[PDB]
Design a protein around this ligand. Sequence first.
Ligand SMILES: Cc1cc(/C=C/C#N)cc(C)c1Nc1ccnc(Nc2ccc(C#N)cc2)n1
Ligand SMILES: Oc1ccc(Br)cc1
Ligand SMILES: [Mg+2]
Lengths: 556, 415
Amino acid sequence: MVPISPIETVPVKLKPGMDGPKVKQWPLTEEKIKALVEICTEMEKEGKISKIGPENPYNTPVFAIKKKDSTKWRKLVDFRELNKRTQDFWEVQLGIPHPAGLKKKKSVTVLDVGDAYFSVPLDEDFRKYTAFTIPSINNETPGIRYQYNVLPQGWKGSPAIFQSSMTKILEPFAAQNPDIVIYQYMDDLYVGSDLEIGQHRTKIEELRQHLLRWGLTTPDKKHQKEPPFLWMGYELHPDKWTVQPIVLPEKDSWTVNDIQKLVGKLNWASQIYPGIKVRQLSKLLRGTKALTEVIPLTEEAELELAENREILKEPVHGVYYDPSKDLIAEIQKQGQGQWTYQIYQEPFKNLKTGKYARMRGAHTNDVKQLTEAVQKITTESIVIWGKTPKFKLPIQKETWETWWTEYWQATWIPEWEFVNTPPLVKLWYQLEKEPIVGAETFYVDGAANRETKLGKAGYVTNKGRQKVVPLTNTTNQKTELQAIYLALQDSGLEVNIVTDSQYALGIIQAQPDKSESELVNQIIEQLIKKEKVYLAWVPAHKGIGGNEQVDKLVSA
Amino acid sequence: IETVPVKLKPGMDGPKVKQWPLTEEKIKALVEICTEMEKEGKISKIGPENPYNTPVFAIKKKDSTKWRKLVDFRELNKRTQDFWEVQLGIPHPAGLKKKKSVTVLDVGDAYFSVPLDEDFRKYTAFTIPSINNETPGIRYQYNVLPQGWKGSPAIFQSSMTKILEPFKKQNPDIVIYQYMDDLYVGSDLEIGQHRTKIEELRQHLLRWGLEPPFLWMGYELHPDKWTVQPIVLPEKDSWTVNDIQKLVGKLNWASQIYPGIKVRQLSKLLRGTKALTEVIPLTEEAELELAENREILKEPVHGVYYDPSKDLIAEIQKQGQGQWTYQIYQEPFKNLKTGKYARMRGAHTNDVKQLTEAVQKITTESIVIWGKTPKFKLPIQKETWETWWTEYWQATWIPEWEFVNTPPLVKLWYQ
Ligand SMILES: Cc1cc(/C=C/C#N)cc(C)c1Nc1ccnc(Nc2ccc(C#N)cc2)n1
Ligand SMILES: Oc1ccc(Br)cc1
Ligand SMILES: [Mg+2]
């Protein structure tokens, strides 16, 4: 024989303080027992399981299931209890490769490594915890006791310990063959390269020789799977990729669950289909989670669905990554807090697409949203390609400079260039830094009784202009905004406004262009129509003229 | 060479912190660094039975072309036992902040000479990720004292004091302080002199070493020229209504810090409903109240004390024009230090780089004065900060931070 190098064992422990499982073996029919005995005898013949004495106190239940439409029986060892007691492992599969980060390959061969999976040795000191019992015929003899010597399917550590063992076996080959890529998915190895088919097929042979050093045999009759590959919801081709077919169903009535699965498909599709939108359809699942409830689709949501159907009419494909070229990312504003983007290297050949949605917030503006989208694409691009793309953004360079220099927070967007494709992001208003000479000065105030919710809002000005409005179902905070609104409504194109509302200044200092509050929205509308607005803050109840007069008018 | 036993704190597991995305250039740098650390025995590859993780990235220290590996041990440092065995804690030298010159040296390479308790190594696990997760991340753990771990200076303390004994006996007026991987060396000498004693000090550890990649560097400070920000009020010959409104606002704010501040006579000038740009003459009662407020503001704040058992808090405001103001305190309105920057380096068009440099300078200031780092309240959205701060970081430690999402009115009063 040819000496084989052994697979080193990973030391395994149970969670601290936890002992092994001691689960009762459920009664089985005489026909399932004889099926399990034959199955386990052959597993024993192959070195997978070994019979144990009666000293081992642990046990895990075993079942017999009929492979349907077959007289064949299949074994199921239910390790649910042992898994709860087994330590946590490092999981490498958590990050899945994105197809848009892959490279073009001329050839991709698949090798079956199932031989290796069911043949990775298990830590000798952990085997006892995998004990199970075949019941005896008529319970007149002791059940047959066995323990695993290999990695048990359904055990918590089997996927991680298999991947780590395979990776360690392959690392020397990969390092010394930098002309190929190797990827392990389930019990298959995928080997890709750009070599001529003969040079490539030699590498595969060489990889088979390397694997034989650990006794790992690969089927000679080469795999049936061939490009395209159906994987993690994608279609992988040699020189392009896409998502598996996206079919939006026809439905006369839509239910909560149906909308959730519609949005899920749209989200999945949005990574290569440009312009997918889901705002109005997601609005339908606000707050409610009764899967069986029917929600009438609003006109807005029917339009969004109709728009999505026409985007999904025909297949779209992405190209793979060419490291020798820059990455470009282009963003468009879609409305109602929705943003879409495309990442490409040569014009009209997208690597991938995507979308970003306005975060939940009382107030917002387009510049902040555009900034957040840039950060998201930047982070996604670091993951997929390891570098930041150059950005093409629908915002003038002058608009960005004015926003960043004057915004109270630090903010930054990476290298970018203006792309003149409406709708453009712009600043809708900008407050003055100094008081305006010649502009009327409005001293505003409001107040509300906390019991009755009755209040007043108003102003007094240096020209003797005055207004007080009685209000119902209001609050101090609402009356303070109403006062500012009244001053804007009644003033000319240039106005100085003096408020004592820290609340109102916090909001306006945040420079919103749309809000949850229709009152803030009315204020924004008024600000947009002014030429110059200076907003001044003073502390309340300090004898400041103007502010003192109107405070007493409104808190009466 | 015999390991000190190290434990986590009671009822506390090891860190399980996700590795954040790394650029291609940082990955390739870390692969090269870790390959040569592995050959030198400093780290070893680990298996899947180790589920712990601490994030890693790479930086370029101030004025260096060579990548430095930086592990973010913030979580492990929180969960690591406190080291009060041999010393309840070296008392923090209050004289360091009073020297004319303080040079900071990276002595972290010395830690690699001491083995790490073999039962604790698992908790130092880290991962070198691959672009697009196309290959399994490279998993390592430390066999020696890691840089950035709070236990490294503690375990190496005994060794450091003996290395430095000949230099300390020959130079008794020098104050030497160790924080994490940094050595702060303060003197009152002429800088030409100063640089030569620093070079003398570097030799002691090359001698003992017999190579450290960054020991040759020197970050020179001058804590005796450090400036502070008292509250100052404008001196004007013509006060507009708006000017007086801003004055009364600022004085009202100051009255939370200083008891005897008054604004009654100044408010009295506003009587009526006047245009914001109208000039108001000060009456003599307002001028006196204002003068009395000026003299209050020249005295220290009452009841301000440092407590080493409480967190330091650092707030920063963007003032524009590359200018930043900051305050360090433990209790509201009881500032222990205030300051202002404008010299932020190579960042005239990058606010986030400026802020990152300000955070580092403030943290350095805090280390020198109190021997620990403050918790920052940063005027930035978390997503913007988290995406970029690592690109401008040049220190070997990392403080804690939270995000300010509502604009503070106090910005006006510190400008
Ligand atoms: C992640 C991955 C999944 C599969 C397959 C999983 C499955 N099922 C196959 C391979 C070889 C890889 N690994 C890599 C690594 C770098 N570039 C590529 N490019 C690449 C991959 C497949 C096709 C095709 N057809 C074309 C190019 N693949
Ligand atoms: O020979 C081997 C079989 C399986 C693995 Br996983 C690693 C090596
Ligand atoms: Mg009031």
